[PDB]
Design a binder for this molecule. Sequence first.
Ligand SMILES: *[C@@H]1O[C@H](CO[C@@H]2O[C@@H](C)[C@@H](O)[C@@H](O)[C@@H]2O)[C@@H](O[C@@H]2O[C@H](CO)[C@@H](O)[C@H](O)[C@H]2NC(C)=O)[C@H](O)[C@H]1NC(C)=O
Ligand SMILES: *[C@@H]1O[C@H](CO[C@@H]2O[C@@H](C)[C@@H](O)[C@@H](O)[C@@H]2O)[C@@H](O[C@@H]2O[C@H](CO)[C@@H](O)[C@H](O)[C@H]2NC(C)=O)[C@H](O)[C@H]1NC(C)=O
Ligand SMILES: *[C@@H]1O[C@H](CO)[C@@H](O[C@@H]2O[C@H](CO)[C@@H](O)[C@H](O)[C@H]2NC(C)=O)[C@H](O)[C@H]1NC(C)=O
Lengths: 374, 365
Amino acid sequence: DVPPYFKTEPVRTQVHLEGNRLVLTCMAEGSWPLEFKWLHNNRELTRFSLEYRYMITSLDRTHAGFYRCIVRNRMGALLQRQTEVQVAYMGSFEEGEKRQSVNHGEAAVIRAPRISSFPRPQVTWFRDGRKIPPSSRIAITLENTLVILSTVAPDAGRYYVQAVNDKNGDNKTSQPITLAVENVPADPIAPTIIIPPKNTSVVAGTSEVTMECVANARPLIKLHIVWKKDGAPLSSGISDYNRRLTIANPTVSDAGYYECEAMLRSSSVAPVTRGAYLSVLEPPQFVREPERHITAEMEKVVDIPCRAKGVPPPSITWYKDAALVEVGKLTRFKQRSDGGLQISGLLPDDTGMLQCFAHNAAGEAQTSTYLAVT
Amino acid sequence: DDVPPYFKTEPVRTQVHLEGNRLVLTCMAEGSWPLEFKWLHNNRELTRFSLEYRYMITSLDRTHAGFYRCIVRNRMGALLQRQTEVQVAYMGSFEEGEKRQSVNEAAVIRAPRISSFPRPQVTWFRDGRKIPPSSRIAITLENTLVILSTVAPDAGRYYVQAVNDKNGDNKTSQPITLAAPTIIIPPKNTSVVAGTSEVTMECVANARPLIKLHIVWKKDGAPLSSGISDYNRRLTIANPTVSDAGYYECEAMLRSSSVAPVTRGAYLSVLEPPQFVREPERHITAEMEKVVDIPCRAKGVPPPSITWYKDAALVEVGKLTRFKQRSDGGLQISGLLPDDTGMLQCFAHNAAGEAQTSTYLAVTS
Ligand SMILES: *[C@@H]1O[C@H](CO[C@@H]2O[C@@H](C)[C@@H](O)[C@@H](O)[C@@H]2O)[C@@H](O[C@@H]2O[C@H](CO)[C@@H](O)[C@H](O)[C@H]2NC(C)=O)[C@H](O)[C@H]1NC(C)=O
Ligand SMILES: *[C@@H]1O[C@H](CO[C@@H]2O[C@@H](C)[C@@H](O)[C@@H](O)[C@@H]2O)[C@@H](O[C@@H]2O[C@H](CO)[C@@H](O)[C@H](O)[C@H]2NC(C)=O)[C@H](O)[C@H]1NC(C)=O
Ligand SMILES: *[C@@H]1O[C@H](CO)[C@@H](O[C@@H]2O[C@H](CO)[C@@H](O)[C@H](O)[C@H]2NC(C)=O)[C@H](O)[C@H]1NC(C)=O
């Protein structure tokens, strides 16, 4: 007569190839009969049974999503930590041949043709069978967009993409995009920001996070890009002709407003500044947890603690036997600001498994306890 | 036409895959043509240099498990990819047959040897009935069954049902027939990386009468009242940090009589993978016959060793007349020759993992 508990919990995220087999397991121990139910995106896949496995013999892209199990017995029920199954795939290039025009000196922006893939494929740009590497005048953005900084007469022509998926090794080629250059002498062009920094969120402890800013000017040689954090100039982590700002091992202290300032050296031209926010996140970690086993007298009031910390601050949710606790309607159940649950006028029907889930955009945490009402 | 090679992405440090599934490793590098790739399994050559950036395994086997890494090269030089550990989930059959053991005292029955990755979850059975951990029944992390105070009805055949949590395999072994404070299962040395959610020390003690037996947990001589579970046999630290490292002791005593306590301890090491403090610039230029200093420092627990490679080849510090490695980990090349031009790679390695930084060395004139 021992309440359920998980011997192991599944990983938060999983990447699998299409056509491969997937085996989900609900590894719990406890008194018989220990039965299991499976959920996909908070929707029931199966009924309660002695089958602790959920198996997909041939994985498809549509099978991607969140899976979790519920284990139960005569004592109560527990919700498994949910796992994200991601299916590696790559479709074909959707768009056909396209046409685009740019003025002489101004920047040509050619977006990579839309193709469905997970993860986003690595892109190599080609013109007439020749690779186009990043250079002083040619930039390739994180969105795999091709940017010609100072367009000239010979820049006109057909550009196409070779995209490769790094998980399944799929390699596909897109349709050509014809770029034309209009009004071909040469006069000074003011510095402008083509690809401004976008809002970027990343979890603490990742290997790298990158901000990006592509600027244009004529002459391009006079163009200089300055990176700032909260108004202060940054001198480290800058690469790719001052268009990339890379932070290795980002911390919550590295969060803030990052600005890209494009200027012309040896000139009186005023700079152009465009910025975005970097958010560094930390998953929930518990500060206060309930005891493994909680015993309490009938008709009395019990305080069950649950506090957690994270960036952003984690929301705290309670479950009673794998079912959501309604603190709104029930007079007996009250939720304290720290996240603790208070049950007043304890009835024998409150006996069972209580679970606390602390959730934030960076992840989820779970702690459980058995409430026995004497 | 003159771009040194570089990696657009790096592979995950560890990946678990099922037997019979297909695995596709990719060497995602960019650079000037011809960009060729070579594959290595446990630092042994799998392929020759070719335009195939993929290594594909149609049907994964247990023998395919190990460390894989690629080398990318072109006219500019070569780079070593960060190695990835491919682990193949499987479970064989129970090898050993029926065994017999006798005890007068505690009965210690090891779980039957079965080949499996990962280690399977084990449920012990007696005569078709599950035997959960109790005041007198302990189950260790190595899945060894320990009956503390054996009695007449304790005798009989015990067997294990083992389940692999990755492929869902479930197998049953052959029966094993079984017919003063001491420490049976002492705390073992445990190393773990920070952020593993949990790490557990274990100590199983035996005494008659068992009710008077008491286990106290200590860290560096100081008693702990938290993280203790399973009848004081388990000490669990949630979200271990480098501060949690140190000597943990299990002390078993009797709350009566003059019998001396028994103490057994082990070391807990919390490790952090290498992270670079100082890195070389993307491109380093230097004059012929002169000396160049290329910096490389990194931190980790334990302190990471630092090794240099030149174009995916180990730098011979044995013949260190021109090449010297400073104690800080920096590389110095004296009497610079035009043949020193190319990709230099600095690998910072620790037991918790490895990190890599690269640079292009151009020797003028
Ligand atoms: C990019 O996001 C910002 C908001 O950033 C938030 O606030 C920061 C202080 C930091 O904590 C970030 O992690 C947050 O996500 C948008 O800027 C404005 O934000 C304020 C609140 O801070 C909001 O009231 C305004 O409405 C936001 N501006 C607009 C136009 O709605 C900014 O707009 C975002 N960028 C884009 C392109 O949408
Ligand atoms: C467990 O390991 C210790 C040594 O641990 C190492 O040193 C610690 C200071 C710490 O840095 C750990 O991370 C290291 O792994 C073993 O201690 C040895 O004990 C024997 C006798 O028992 C003695 O002869 C040796 O000199 C000791 N070695 C050291 C380095 O002190 C201990 O034996 C290990 N436990 C078991 C059960 O083998
Ligand atoms: C992706 O596949 C394409 C072909 O589908 C490869 O491109 C070929 O490369 C050879 C080698 O010189 C050329 O002879 C062919 O003409 C190319 N085909 C096309 C359609 O251009 C390409 O190499 C593959 N990707 C990688 C990274 O190797």
